[PDB]
Amino acid sequence: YELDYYSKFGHTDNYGNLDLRNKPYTQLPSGFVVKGNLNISQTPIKKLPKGLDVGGSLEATNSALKTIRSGTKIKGYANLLGSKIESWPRGIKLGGYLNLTDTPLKTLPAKLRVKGDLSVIRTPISALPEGLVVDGNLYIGGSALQVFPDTMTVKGNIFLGGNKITKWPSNLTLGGAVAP
Amino acid sequence: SLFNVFNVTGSAMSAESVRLNTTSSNLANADSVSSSAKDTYKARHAVFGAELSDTVPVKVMGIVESDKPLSAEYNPDHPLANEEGYIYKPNVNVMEEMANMISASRAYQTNVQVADSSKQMLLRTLQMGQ
Amino acid sequence: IVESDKPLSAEYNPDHPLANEEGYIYKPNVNVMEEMANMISASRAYQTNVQVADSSKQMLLRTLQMGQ
């Protein structure tokens, strides 16, 4: 079934964080607003509603989340560890890091900006989008990436983690170090 | 060897200490409506795990929070009350914490006996050759 | 090493996130009373063989003194 207004109230804390862990909810109403953090870990939710607003961070670790629609506003970070997300939509306003470890993610939006750290660890992604900007640490360990785009920006450390990079960006300014 | 018993039993001594501290924080936060970190505390549990990697030490793999819904109480005049007027309190269950308190103490003390038992065997093994 | 054939100890706890459909968490089939007895039996039997091995060396040492 689907979450109602009264069922929403029974999964909210004092400061306004929605906890849906292991709960049997399949879809959320459109134009959904959360006062604080949102947790949809281990949920059978396969799609996030259009116009979704989260006043905190989105937690979807080891969930069945697959599709996020554009226009979603997230003030905190996005944690989609172990979910079933295959692509990242364009135009997501993310106020924090993006953790996509152990996901079937294949494609990323062009010129994507991550205000925090980025993770593509053990993902089947083949190539990073052109003009990528990362303000934190980039972990690509165990992924299928082997060629970086012509231009990219990482303001922290770059962790190869084991994968072999052969074509480095022509224009790259690094605020940290590169680790294998 | 008999020294591996000390590593295995010693790991359980630390393991049961983690669960005791987690229970202590649960008992002390059973009536705390507010919390720094913008999160209404929820009951935490230490999930043990055998690290097979003969001798199988026990390791704490991380603390996990309770899945029970928070206890909602209608307190309309509280500053933390929502529009409907309900304030939410942690889902700490007193009875399970008391049961965890007993089990953690009983398991902690029986690991001391095994370490003591292995100690005597090593001392006798050293008396051979003298 | 062989695992025991005793059925796992089932506990009703629809709060642990690692539970199942019926709210059951299965726990190891370890019996404390049989572990205490094994601890007593293992320690005593281990130290008994220390005495036999230690006394065996004495017999070997006395053999070297034959004819002296």
Partner: peptide, 24 residues
């Protein structure tokens, strides 16, 4: 890995991925 919902002891920062927990 192991448990899927372990916590993190580091203070919230919302910008750095917590490496305290086994994030795999």
């Amino acid at each position: 890995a192991g448990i899927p919902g372990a916590l993190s002891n580091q203070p919230p920062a919302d910008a750095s991925i917590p490496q305290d927990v086994a994030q795999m």
